[PDB]
Amino acid sequence: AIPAFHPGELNVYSAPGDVADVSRALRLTGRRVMLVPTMGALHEGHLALVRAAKRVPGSVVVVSIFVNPPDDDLAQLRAEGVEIAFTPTTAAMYPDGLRTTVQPGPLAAELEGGPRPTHFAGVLTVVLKLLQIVRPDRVFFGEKDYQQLVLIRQLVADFNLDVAVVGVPTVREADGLAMSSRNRYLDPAQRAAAVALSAALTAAAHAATAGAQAALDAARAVLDAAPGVAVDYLELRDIGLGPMPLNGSGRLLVAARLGTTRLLDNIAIEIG
Amino acid sequence: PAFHPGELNVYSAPGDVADVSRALRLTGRRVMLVPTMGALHEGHLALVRAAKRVPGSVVVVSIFVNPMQFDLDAYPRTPDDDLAQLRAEGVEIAFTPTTAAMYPDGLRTTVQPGPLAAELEGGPRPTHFAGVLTVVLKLLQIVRPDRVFFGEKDYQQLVLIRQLVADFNLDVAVVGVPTVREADGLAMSSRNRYLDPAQRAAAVALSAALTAAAHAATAGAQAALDAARAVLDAAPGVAVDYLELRDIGLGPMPLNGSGRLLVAARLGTTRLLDNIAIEIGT
Ligand SMILES: O=C(O)[C@@H]1COc2ccccc2O1
């Protein structure tokens, strides 16, 4: 006997099997279930994911809130017109501890996998779990976390998952700083120098008419002009994060440490 | 793709069985999946029949020698026979993927099983269960059945498959089906064809040892194990890999009153497995 669901209101479920039941019962009456996976502490970047999910005809929006090991977040979802939030406990998600998990391909070891070499296994495992619980038609991820998005596409292809993965463009502050809840930790100096990540990336995107080396040199010059910005990497790759082709579409990714804060950004790049 | 019902439809492309599967489900048929590596025998057909017996069932049997779990060139391949067997059971769908369609990106994203996959069958073959759980996950995602059928012969495999299913929240019921035996007790296996008449006769020691142990078990664990050990020792050219008494989920839990007894042994070059349910004492 299917759990209670009230149209046009924010229905909150904590039990995987509840949200599973409602979702499956909703698809059968012709709603198209959209999944927005989040870790709570919602900002505009999350809201953009929600909005893209809402403009699918017949969409009902599922937003998970789960910290991979509050009333505010729900008021934001309530205010965005979201019908389902899925807010499970660590024990509901992992009732048997860390047992079977997803092992990512070699990409999970590069770039962000450098300092956090198990991070994406964690991410892929929970994403796979969420996809099985909710069974969405479409799943929404921000391009901010670009490597993560490429790995999730890989998970979906690799395990024959029958879901569309949708990548939503990065939401930025007025000066271009990619939104993140870490941005709140930057002191004034750091916050001003932080602009250089997106300025370098945009500078590169336009320098690219002159070829790849010009793009990289433009990005580097800009980063070089900022104080207190320790670049962990600055790399140009193809859109799937393999080696950059001689010309054609690419992606430029950067990561840096400002004090104790690690910021990331990336951007689409055409070569030529 | 076409579906001529009451007939056996063979699809090789993942896409074609996914589409046909979904369509059949959207019309109310209950999709049953029986994954196999072909070279089918009566132990497979009992898996098929359990599936047929579920009402509104449409039966998918998958046949795929998975290069990730492997030795690989030595596996028995008998498709004409396999296919005529399924016609004869009135199986409506055979799913026979190519390696390229299953591994277009080689080994990229794979399943990592729990610590149970390092033990028993997995001790000298630490990657074996990874390949099994990877292809099983993919097959469940392609075919999307209500239920999935496995023999208890490969009991460790069965237990890890239920780990797969619980840990990743798969919305599928796993059905364990009791081991089919030759009239002398020998567990049916595609591997059995590799025993000469001598080894075939010795091979009965495995089920004899287990059934002995199951009845000796009123006298306790040690008696059951000694009973099995005695039978195996009296068998000519049976070399025991392991003989182990475990809890039924095989795991970090102590054996209570209920268990499973597991044996692996070499006859010549052929490895056999068998297992049985043990009740200890009362
Ligand atoms: O043919 C068989 O016995 C095995 C039984 O176990 C299998 C597990 C996954 C995929 C195929 C399988 O085939």
Ligand SMILES: O=C(O)[C@H]1COc2ccccc2O1
């Ligand atoms: O809060 C977030 O930004 C997101 C970012 O990506 C996520 C992926 C999987 C589960 C939760 C996630 O939360």
